[PDB]
């Protein structure tokens with residue numbers, strides 16, 4: 001087996017989890033230690049179902065930029081025995097574009113799902129259900145409901161979390177390493 005498939009499968013195995021909040025089904029990315037990240041609109045409460053058990057959330061942090069504008073990411077710290085494999089070195093120090101990215105989804109409804117979203121470009125501002133959002137990127141792929149949390153990735157790099165779409169395009173919140181330091 002080759003490098004790109006091996007990397008995405010290993011991600012699925014170690015870092016990308018099936019979860020459910022009161023808002024329904026999402027893909028969650030575990031980054032290091034007890035720190036994971038979800039799309040903000042998933043509204044994780046005091047607990048979150050992770051794969052096969054209800055896990056308690058010790059802390060949630062909604063990321064805003066310097067303007068106080070929503071970045072549509074929530075850092076959660078879990079009460080678990082698990083330490084996630086540390087993947088912070090796969091996340092670029094700044095929000096980076098990519099060519100021929102793959103969206104990795106892992107939901108009860110869409111388990112271990114690989115979606116070739118193609119090239120990923122800077123987008124910046126995006127208006128989501130009346131919520132304005134910054135630092136987004138775009139891919140021209142008709143992404144759909146149930147795919148939020150999905151992990152945008154390419155050549156051993158983890159560059160975004162899927163958050164939205166318009167029926168023709170999809171959009172992710174971009175990752176940078178400092179969010180997880």
Ligand SMILES: */C(=C/C(=O)OCC)[C@H](C[C@@H]1CCNC1=O)NC(=O)[C@H](Cc1ccccc1)NC(=O)C(=O)NCCC1CC1
Pocket residue numbers: 041072126127128129130131142143144145146147148163164165166167169170171
């Ligand atoms: C993922 C969440 C989900 O499935 O829950 C039910 C909504 C979902 C994926 C996109 C839906 C349609 N196609 C997709 O790829 N995202 C959303 O539903 C988000 C929710 C959101 C995000 C930020 C703040 C508040 C809510 N919203 C949208 O996709 C959206 O509101 N509008 C699409 C058009 C606007 C981008 C121009």
